[PDB]
Write an enzyme that holds these catalytic residues in place. Structure first.
Site, PDB file in Angstrom:
ATOM      1  N   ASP A 180    -183.849 -16.490  52.811  1.00 25.11           N
ATOM      2  CA  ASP A 180    -183.741 -17.398  51.675  1.00 25.11           C
ATOM      3  C   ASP A 180    -182.420 -17.122  50.943  1.00 25.11           C
ATOM      4  OD1 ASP A 180    -185.139 -19.421  49.840  1.00 25.11           O
ATOM      5  OD2 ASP A 180    -184.385 -17.856  48.470  1.00 25.11           O
ATOM      6  N   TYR A 238    -176.255 -17.579  44.244  1.00 20.97           N
ATOM      7  CA  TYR A 238    -176.379 -16.133  44.379  1.00 20.97           C
ATOM      8  C   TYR A 238    -175.055 -15.456  44.642  1.00 20.97           C
ATOM      9  CZ  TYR A 238    -181.325 -17.397  45.143  1.00 20.97           C
ATOM     10  OH  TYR A 238    -182.595 -17.978  45.057  1.00 20.97           O
ATOM     11  N   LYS A 292    -179.971 -23.792  49.049  1.00 14.10           N
ATOM     12  CA  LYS A 292    -180.332 -24.612  47.920  1.00 14.10           C
ATOM     13  C   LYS A 292    -179.089 -25.252  47.324  1.00 14.10           C
ATOM     14  CE  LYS A 292    -183.890 -21.117  46.985  1.00 14.10           C
ATOM     15  NZ  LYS A 292    -183.110 -19.853  47.229  1.00 14.10           N
ATOM     16  N   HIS A 327    -182.449 -26.862  43.938  1.00  8.51           N
ATOM     17  CA  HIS A 327    -182.812 -25.565  43.366  1.00  8.51           C
ATOM     18  C   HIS A 327    -183.661 -25.705  42.100  1.00  8.51           C
ATOM     19  CE1 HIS A 327    -181.157 -21.187  43.406  1.00  8.51           C
ATOM     20  NE2 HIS A 327    -182.364 -21.145  42.852  1.00  8.51           N
TER      21      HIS A 327
HETATM   22  N1  LIG Z   1    -185.951 -20.918  43.719  1.00 13.17           N
HETATM   23  C1  LIG Z   1    -185.710 -20.155  42.666  1.00 13.17           C
HETATM   24  O1  LIG Z   1    -185.431 -20.598  41.546  1.00 13.17           O
HETATM   25  C2  LIG Z   1    -185.843 -18.683  42.848  1.00 13.17           C
HETATM   26  C3  LIG Z   1    -186.025 -17.859  41.733  1.00 13.17           C
HETATM   27  C4  LIG Z   1    -186.243 -16.496  41.922  1.00 13.17           C
HETATM   28  C5  LIG Z   1    -186.288 -15.958  43.186  1.00 13.17           C
HETATM   29  N2  LIG Z   1    -186.007 -16.779  44.287  1.00 13.17           N
HETATM   30  C6  LIG Z   1    -185.953 -16.231  45.666  1.00 13.17           C
HETATM   31  O2  LIG Z   1    -187.065 -15.333  45.834  1.00 13.17           O
HETATM   32  C7  LIG Z   1    -186.561 -14.038  46.196  1.00 13.17           C
HETATM   33  C8  LIG Z   1    -187.518 -12.963  45.760  1.00 13.17           C
HETATM   34  O3  LIG Z   1    -187.627 -12.933  44.318  1.00 13.17           O
HETATM   35  P1  LIG Z   1    -186.866 -11.868  43.411  1.00 13.17           P
HETATM   36  O4  LIG Z   1    -185.604 -11.438  44.056  1.00 13.17           O
HETATM   37  O5  LIG Z   1    -186.800 -12.480  42.059  1.00 13.17           O
HETATM   38  O6  LIG Z   1    -187.843 -10.622  43.299  1.00 13.17           O
HETATM   39  P2  LIG Z   1    -188.990  -9.867  44.161  1.00 13.17           P
HETATM   40  O7  LIG Z   1    -188.812 -10.171  45.593  1.00 13.17           O
HETATM   41  O8  LIG Z   1    -190.274 -10.146  43.483  1.00 13.17           O
HETATM   42  O9  LIG Z   1    -188.632  -8.365  43.802  1.00 13.17           O
HETATM   43  C9  LIG Z   1    -187.397  -7.789  44.280  1.00 13.17           C
HETATM   44  C10 LIG Z   1    -187.349  -6.373  43.732  1.00 13.17           C
HETATM   45  O10 LIG Z   1    -188.462  -5.620  44.316  1.00 13.17           O
HETATM   46  C11 LIG Z   1    -187.929  -4.428  44.890  1.00 13.17           C
HETATM   47  N3  LIG Z   1    -188.744  -4.105  46.051  1.00 13.17           N
HETATM   48  C12 LIG Z   1    -188.756  -4.786  47.254  1.00 13.17           C
HETATM   49  N4  LIG Z   1    -189.618  -4.282  48.108  1.00 13.17           N
HETATM   50  C13 LIG Z   1    -190.180  -3.221  47.446  1.00 13.17           C
HETATM   51  C14 LIG Z   1    -191.130  -2.288  47.881  1.00 13.17           C
HETATM   52  N5  LIG Z   1    -191.659  -2.255  49.090  1.00 13.17           N
HETATM   53  N6  LIG Z   1    -191.446  -1.316  46.976  1.00 13.17           N
HETATM   54  C15 LIG Z   1    -190.892  -1.310  45.744  1.00 13.17           C
HETATM   55  N7  LIG Z   1    -189.996  -2.174  45.260  1.00 13.17           N
HETATM   56  C16 LIG Z   1    -189.656  -3.116  46.181  1.00 13.17           C
HETATM   57  C17 LIG Z   1    -186.492  -4.709  45.217  1.00 13.17           C
HETATM   58  O11 LIG Z   1    -185.751  -3.480  45.242  1.00 13.17           O
HETATM   59  P3  LIG Z   1    -184.574  -3.166  46.271  1.00 13.17           P
HETATM   60  O12 LIG Z   1    -183.886  -4.469  46.625  1.00 13.17           O
HETATM   61  O13 LIG Z   1    -183.748  -2.191  45.474  1.00 13.17           O
HETATM   62  O14 LIG Z   1    -185.228  -2.525  47.474  1.00 13.17           O
HETATM   63  C18 LIG Z   1    -186.082  -5.610  44.032  1.00 13.17           C
HETATM   64  O15 LIG Z   1    -185.733  -4.815  42.889  1.00 13.17           O
HETATM   65  C19 LIG Z   1    -185.175 -14.009  45.598  1.00 13.17           C
HETATM   66  O16 LIG Z   1    -184.373 -12.946  46.072  1.00 13.17           O
HETATM   67  C20 LIG Z   1    -184.684 -15.405  45.964  1.00 13.17           C
HETATM   68  O17 LIG Z   1    -184.361 -15.414  47.332  1.00 13.17           O
HETATM   69  C21 LIG Z   1    -185.821 -18.114  44.122  1.00 13.17           C
HETATM   70  N1  LIG Z   2    -183.011 -17.470  34.647  1.00 16.39           N
HETATM   71  C1  LIG Z   2    -183.582 -18.096  35.701  1.00 16.39           C
HETATM   72  O1  LIG Z   2    -184.744 -18.487  35.765  1.00 16.39           O
HETATM   73  C2  LIG Z   2    -182.669 -18.272  36.891  1.00 16.39           C
HETATM   74  C3  LIG Z   2    -183.287 -17.579  38.098  1.00 16.39           C
HETATM   75  C4  LIG Z   2    -182.372 -17.690  39.311  1.00 16.39           C
HETATM   76  N2  LIG Z   2    -182.840 -16.874  40.419  1.00 16.39           N
HETATM   77  C5  LIG Z   2    -182.922 -17.590  41.554  1.00 16.39           C
HETATM   78  O2  LIG Z   2    -183.201 -17.152  42.668  1.00 16.39           O
HETATM   79  N3  LIG Z   2    -182.684 -18.921  41.256  1.00 16.39           N
HETATM   80  C6  LIG Z   2    -182.385 -19.086  39.958  1.00 16.39           C
HETATM   81  O3  LIG Z   2    -182.132 -20.121  39.375  1.00 16.39           O
HETATM   82  C7  LIG Z   2    -180.917 -17.375  38.938  1.00 16.39           C
HETATM   83  C8  LIG Z   2    -179.986 -17.044  39.898  1.00 16.39           C
HETATM   84  C9  LIG Z   2    -178.678 -16.849  39.534  1.00 16.39           C
HETATM   85  F1  LIG Z   2    -177.783 -16.515  40.504  1.00 16.39           F
HETATM   86  C10 LIG Z   2    -178.240 -16.972  38.260  1.00 16.39           C
HETATM   87  C11 LIG Z   2    -179.174 -17.303  37.302  1.00 16.39           C
HETATM   88  C12 LIG Z   2    -180.509 -17.515  37.629  1.00 16.39           C
HETATM   89  O4  LIG Z   2    -181.371 -17.790  36.591  1.00 16.39           O
HETATM   90 CL   LIG Z   3    -177.821 -22.816  44.678  1.00 20.08          CL
END
Ligand SMILES: NC(=O)c1ccc[n+]([C@@H]2O[C@H](COP(=O)([O-])OP(=O)(O)OC[C@H]3O[C@@H](n4cnc5c(N)ncnc54)[C@H](OP(=O)(O)O)[C@@H]3O)[C@@H](O)[C@H]2O)c1
Ligand SMILES: NC(=O)[C@@H]1C[C@]2(NC(=O)NC2=O)c2cc(F)ccc2O1
Ligand SMILES: [Cl-]
EC number: 1.1.1.21
Length: 316
Positions: A44, A49, A78, A111
């Protein structure tokens, strides 16, 4: 559990992918290389990012290496909010493709439903800190997304952070050519999304759960915030199953017929997070995890809360 879920475009999507938001550019290439080596087939991504070039280096090396075939990968990116303008959508997609070193995306998502003023800044602000909208109708942005399918740039299109009235607007678009394949939304035991998920699945739209671990690296975390990974009740479910709390948090959405995209740059955790296909949570476990909901939402950008399409004023 099947490893893939069938989308309404006829393609299969791996139910586990690697998230890349916040993955530092000097670590994300190794993270993605390790992920592919240890079985991930879904990454993803997003332009916002600021690390797609480095993600792409990893993908390209593994393709060149013949560690995997392109058809076996499922790469998602996205369209950022400053590109909702039907003359910018194709160029935004092409920049992502060029950075990822790909000639198509498996899935390209709007997005957010909120369009912002085009320009260099990803969050263009007025002098009081409110995001500056664009007037582009999202239905028009959707038509621009449909063109990308017809041009061969993307195999599927979808949406992210759309509430159910916004999903409904797309589904009711006059002349709709392609339905959204996916809605990617925040989802975890503290924000269980039951209403929004039931609506989307009923329409045949697959839901992807983002921040499934509660995004502990979110830049606005406070030491007093809820912590999924530290919740003793979730740790107890994990212990009963001889799994980690993260593994439970990943398996949970999988058993709701969701796709899930945990982020890590830690090689051992990348490999850990993938070891979730060999156990099952009971229905009782599932209902217990669902019971932890609190409408705790970690992605809720304050600068956007007056945008006319801000998604989170609606209940769902
Ligand atoms: N569409 C959107 O608006 C949107 C918004 C938010 C997120 N996303 C997508 O969803 C993805 C996941 O969400 P997120 O990055 O917000 O957070 P997440 O996946 O809920 O949490 C990531 C965090 O958890 C830690 N972690 C991972 N595996 C672990 C484990 N086994 N034990 C302990 N800690 C662990 C990571 O640490 P380390 O990396 O240090 O290992 C990092 O600090 C994003 O990266 C992005 O691709 C999309
Ligand atoms: N504050 C929010 O909810 C969003 C989250 C968010 N993370 C993610 O994966 N999509 C988003 O849009 C994000 C990512 C960025 F690189 C910069 C800002 C940002 O803000
Ligand atoms: Cl984007």
């Amino acid at each position: 559990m099947a490893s893939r879920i069938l989308l309404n475009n006829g393609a299969k999507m791996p139910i586990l992918g690697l998230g890349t938001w916040k993955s530092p550019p000097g670590q994300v290439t190794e993270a993605v290389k390790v992920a592919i080596d240890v079985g991930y087939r879904h990454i993803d991504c997003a332009h916002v990012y600021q690390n797609e070039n480095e993600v792409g280096v990893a993908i390209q090396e593994k393709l060149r290496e013949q560690v995997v075939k392109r058809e076996e990968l499922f790469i998602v990116s996205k369209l950022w909010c400053t590109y909702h303008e039907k003359g910018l959508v194709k160029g935004a997609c092409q920049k992502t493709l060029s950075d990822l070193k790909l000639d198509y995306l498996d899935l390209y998502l709007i997005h957010w439903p909120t369009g912002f003023k085009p320009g260099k800044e990803f969050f263009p602000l007025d002098e009081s800190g409110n995001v500056v909208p664009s007037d582009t109708n999202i239905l028009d942005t959707w038509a621009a997304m449909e063109e990308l399918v017809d041009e061969g740039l993307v195999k599927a299109i979808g949406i992210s952070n759309f509430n159910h009235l916004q999903v409904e607007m797309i589904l009711n678009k006059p002349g709709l050519k392609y339905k959204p394949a996916v809605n990617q939304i925040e989802c975890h035991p503290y924000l269980t999304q039951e209403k929004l998920i039931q609506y989307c699945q009923s329409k045949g739209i697959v839901v992807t759960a983002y921040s499934p671990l509660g995004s502990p690296d979110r830049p606005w975390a406070k030491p007093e915030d809820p912590s999924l990974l530290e919740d003793p009740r979730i740790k107890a479910i994990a212990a009963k199953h001889n799994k980690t709390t993260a593994q439970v948090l990943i398996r949970f959405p999988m058993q709701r017929n969701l796709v899930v995209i945990p982020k890590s740059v830690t090689p051992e955790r990348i490999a850990e997070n993938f070891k979730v296909f060999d156990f099952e949570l009971s229905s009782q476990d599932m209902t217990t995890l669902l019971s932890y909901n609190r409408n705790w939402r970690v992605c809720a950008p304050l600068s956007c809360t007056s945008h006319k399409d801000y998604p989170f004023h609606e209940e769902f």
